[PDB]
Ligand binder design. Structure first.
Ligand SMILES: CCCCCCCCCCCC[N+](C)(C)[O-]
Ligand SMILES: CCCCCCCCCCCC[N+](C)(C)[O-]
Length: 392
């Protein structure tokens, strides 16, 4: 009757919801070619779909943690899942690529609920031991989605309409809702205390005064930008630009995200014998080399996408190795409340992702693949520059 055993339905449905929102990005990108063809809109709106999605995900970030603390985790979390379901369904009525993009933004708001409320309840619900396993599963979900999403999405548009994908996301989120409704406990400490936006603002201005934290948080954004820009732009780079098929598009995803996974796997084996600082340095080598290779190759020949793919694969391996550690060090760089620290670094990342994808898009539209990879290289260099400051 659920006390001990079915308690695990709560983290399981949170994980399911997380997955739904992630493929809500990752399946959609390859489907954006069908979408933009349906609306008769330019291919410049393809990466923008992801920009809007991620922009929405920085929207309520700062708010939801302290808000749910006051009015409770259950009603806020469940409202987020419902909002995801409703906005997933509403996009079928879009009628315009501008209105489509607006709904991508509104959909992305659902992202904020995962970390700021759902995971806050996890940390408040479970022992440090079990909590570790849960974050591990959430981390693995974040690994699987970008691998499976583009493959499933590319296959999907040869069979079913793009609208069906949003019906899928909504269905999966519906399952999480009913699971969370009957499982998730109320962990909120600060009911019914008042919330000061004035003092909340003061907290964020305080975390932003810490220079090491800001360096680490910005670096996490810059270093992952090439990966996310590839996710955003790969449908137009491959299919539109190189005139390859959907099958090849799918194939190129395998070494890149397989390498990401390989890097995390090597991380799990090294972590007991290696400090996070040295794993950052260890990952730094394939990160810089991979980005250098993709840039140099496509400046020599704009059309070599296999060298670009290899370079991104080597880079993604380094990311897999270096990233989890930088997240930890960045978290611990500030002594403030972890909810405030987490939301701050999530917002700084999203800021770099959204703006960076847009810059990336105009880079490729004007300069082709060479410029795509050159902009990715400067982002690597920005991460590197921040690391020599960050440590020590
Ligand atoms: C490993 C890169 C870390 C980037 C963190 C992005 C937050 C996830 C928001 C949904 C986006 C899904 N995506 C494209 C990252 O796979
Ligand atoms: C020994 C410390 C206890 C005295 C502080 C009174 C509690 C007020 C809490 C205000 C919240 C501040 N903050 C940083 C969380 O925004």
């Amino acid at each position: 009757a659920r006390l001990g055993r079915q308690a695990l339905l709560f983290p399981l449905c949170l994980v399911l919801y997380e997955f739904s929102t992630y493929i809500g990005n990752d399946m959609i990108q390859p489907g954006m070619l069908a979408v933009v063809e349906q609306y008769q809109a330019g291919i410049d709106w393809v990466p923008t779909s992801m920009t809007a999605y991620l922009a929405g995900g920085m929207f309520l970030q700062w708010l939801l943690g302290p808000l749910s603390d006051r009015i409770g985790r259950r009603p806020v979390m469940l409202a987020g899942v419902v909002w995801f379901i409703v906005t997933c369904l509403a996009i079928l009525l879009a009628q315009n690529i501008e209105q489509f993009t607006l709904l991508r933004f509104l959909q992305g708001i659902s992202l904020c609920f995962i970390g700021a409320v759902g995971y806050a309840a996890i940390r408040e619900s479970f022992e440090e031991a079990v909590c570790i396993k849960i974050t591990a599963l959430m981390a693995n979900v974040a690994l699987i989605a970008p691998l499976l999403g583009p493959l499933v999405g590319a296959a999907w548009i040869h069979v079913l309409p793009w609208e069906g994908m949003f019906v899928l996301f909504a269905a999966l989120a519906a399952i999480s809702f009913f699971g969370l409704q009957r499982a998730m406990p109320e962990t909120a400490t600060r009911i019914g205390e008042k919330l000061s936006l004035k003092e909340l603002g003061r907290d964020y201005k305080l975390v932003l005064k810490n220079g090491r934290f800001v360096a680490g948080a910005l670096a996490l954004g810059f270093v992952s930008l090439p990966l996310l820009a590839w996710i955003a732009q790969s449908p137009i780079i491959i299919i539109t630009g190189e005139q390859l098929s959907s099958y090849e598009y799918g194939l190129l995803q395998v070494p890149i995200f397989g390498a990401l996974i390989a890097g995390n796997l090597l991380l799990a084996r090294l972590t007991s014998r290696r400090t996070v600082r040295s794993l950052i340095i260890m990952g730094g080598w394939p990160i810089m080399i991979g980005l250098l290779v993709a840039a140099a190759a496509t400046v020599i020949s704009s059309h070599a996408y296999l060298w670009m793919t290899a370079g991104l694969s080597i880079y993604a391996f380094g990311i897999g190795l270096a990233n989890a550690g930088l997240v930890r060090l960045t978290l611990f760089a500030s002594d403030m409340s972890k909810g405030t620290v987490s939301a701050a670094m999530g917002m700084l990342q999203m800021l770099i992702f959204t703006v960076g994808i847009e810059i990336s898009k105009h880079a490729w539209l004007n300069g082709g693949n060479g410029l795509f990879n050159l902009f990715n290289l400067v982002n690597g260099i920005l991460w590197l520059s921040l690391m020599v400051i960050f440590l020590k």
